[PDB]
C-alpha cells in the first residue's frame, strides 16, 4: 500500500472575535504530523452574543468540524516515509436554534 | 520532492439549516482527486437571521474557510499532494 507521492504543498480574519458565535484558537501540535500545527476553534460561549452584546443561552455556539487528511511519519524509525490518516478538526463556530 | 506514503487511511447534523448564518452545500467533483467529492458551502443570505426569524443587514453571513490537503492522480506521462482552500460553513459577524 506504499505509493510514491510528489510534494507540491509549497506556497488575517478576525471572524473569531467578531462572530455572534466567537471562538478562541487552540494549538494542535503533533511533531510527527504534516501539518505539524493545526489551529482548532474552541467556542468561547455555550450560547451566542445578542445585539445588546450579551450571551443569549437559548441560542447555541456550535463548532463546524471537517474531516481532513494528514501525513504521519511511519514507520517512526524511517524518514522520507509516511502514512495517510484522517483527523476531525474544528474550523470555527456558528450560531444555531435548539430542537 | 517525492515521499513514500501508505495510502491505507487511518481514522450527520443540520447546522447548515439551523444557523443565523445558514448555508447550502454545492457539489465539487473531480474524478482525479481524493477526495473525489468535496461539499463546499455558500452563505444563503448576505445578512443574518435575527431573534424573530427575519434578516438583519447589519449582521453578516461570512464563510469559514480552511486549507485542506488533497491527492491528484499524476498523469500517465502516481499521485501529487496539493493544498486547496474550501468553505466548510458560514458564521455571523459584525463590522
Amino acid at each position: 500500500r506504499t505509493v510514491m507521492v510528489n510534494l507540491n504543498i509549497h506556497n488575517s480574519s478576525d471572524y473569531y472575535n467578531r462572530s455572534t458565535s466567537p471562538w478562541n484558537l487552540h494549538r494542535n501540535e503533533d511533531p510527527e504530523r504534516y501539518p505539524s500545527v493545526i489551529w482548532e476553534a474552541k467556542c468561547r460561549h455555550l450560547g451566542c452574543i445578542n445585539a445588546d452584546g450579551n450571551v443569549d443561552y437559548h441560542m447555541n455556539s456550535v463548532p463546524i468540524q471537517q474531516e481532513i487528511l494528514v501525513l504521519r511519519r511511519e514507520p517512526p524509525h524511517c524518514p522520507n516515509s509516511f502514512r495517510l490518516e484522517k483527523i476531525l478538526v474544528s474550523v470555527g463556530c456558528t450560531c444555531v436554534t435548539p430542537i | 520532492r517525492t515521499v513514500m506514503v501508505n495510502l491505507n487511511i487511518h481514522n450527520s447534523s443540520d447546522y447548515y439549516n439551523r444557523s443565523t448564518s445558514p448555508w447550502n452545500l454545492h457539489r465539487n467533483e473531480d474524478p482525479e482527486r481524493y477526495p473525489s467529492v468535496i461539499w463546499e458551502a455558500k452563505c444563503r443570505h448576505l445578512g443574518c437571521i435575527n431573534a424573530d426569524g427575519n434578516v438583519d443587514y447589519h449582521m453578516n453571513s461570512v464563510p469559514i474557510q480552511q486549507e485542506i490537503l488533497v491527492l491528484r492522480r499524476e498523469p500517465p506521462h502516481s499521485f501529487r499532494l496539493e493544498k486547496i482552500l474550501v468553505s466548510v460553513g458560514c458564521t455571523c459577524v459584525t463590522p
Epitope: 505509493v3 | 495510502l7 487511511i9 474524478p31 473525489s36
Partner: antibody
Framework: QVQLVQSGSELKKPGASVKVSCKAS????????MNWVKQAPGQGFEWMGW????????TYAQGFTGRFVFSLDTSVSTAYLQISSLKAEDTATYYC??????????WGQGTTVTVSS | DVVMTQTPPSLPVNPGEPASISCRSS???????????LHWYLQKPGQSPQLLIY???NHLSGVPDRFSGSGSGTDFTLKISWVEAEDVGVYFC?????????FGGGTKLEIKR
Amino acid sequence: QVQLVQSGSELKKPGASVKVSCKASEYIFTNYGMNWVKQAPGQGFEWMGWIDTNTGEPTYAQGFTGRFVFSLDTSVSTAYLQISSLKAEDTATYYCANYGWGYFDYWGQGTTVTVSS
Amino acid sequence: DVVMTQTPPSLPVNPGEPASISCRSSQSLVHSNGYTYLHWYLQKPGQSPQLLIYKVSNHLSGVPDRFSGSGSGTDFTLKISWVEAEDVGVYFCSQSTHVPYTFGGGTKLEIKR
C-alpha cells in the same frame, strides 16, 4: 494485478432474496468505490450504482432504488449485492467492477442469478 | 441518461487485418475538469471483462500500441491493427463523465474465414 473474485451461481424462487459477494485479492486505493453492473440475458450492461470503499456510503442508479442494497466488509476485502422480492427481470449476470480516478480498472467474472418457480 | 450508440454489433476480421469500432454519445463527454471519461473494455470468451484504453487514448501497462483510442466530444473510435486470435471477444465503451455511467451495446470480434 488485483483480482476481484465474485461469489457463485444462484438459483432463487420469485419473492426471494439473494446476496452476491465480490472479494478483492488485495486493498484498492480509490477516490470512488466498487460499482455494480446488471446484464440481462442477450442484453447490454446496465449500471446499478456504487458504494464508497472509504465511507461505506452507497449511491443507487434510478433503476435500482428499492430492493437493492450494496454493502461492504473491509476485514475480508469483500463487497455484497443484495436483491429482494426477486422477479423475472432480475434473472441476469451481475458484475462487480472497481472504479477509481475516472474509470473501471478491474471487473469480477460475474455471478449468474436465475429466478425460477 | 447519456446513450452510447456503439457499432457495429458484430465485426468479422481477417487475422493480421485491422478492426475499427465506433462509440457515439447523446451529448459531450467533456467533464467540467477538462478530461473526457470515455473508456474501452474487452470481455474475452469465458473471462472477466478487462480494461484496454481509459480517458479516450490512455493505455493500461500491458495493452500494446496496436490498440488505439481516438475521438472528441460525442464521437469516439477504438482501432485494433494486427487482429490476432487472442483478440476474439466483446469490445464495449463506457462513459463515466455523466451519472448514471452508461455503456455501448458491445461489438463481437470474430475471426473471418
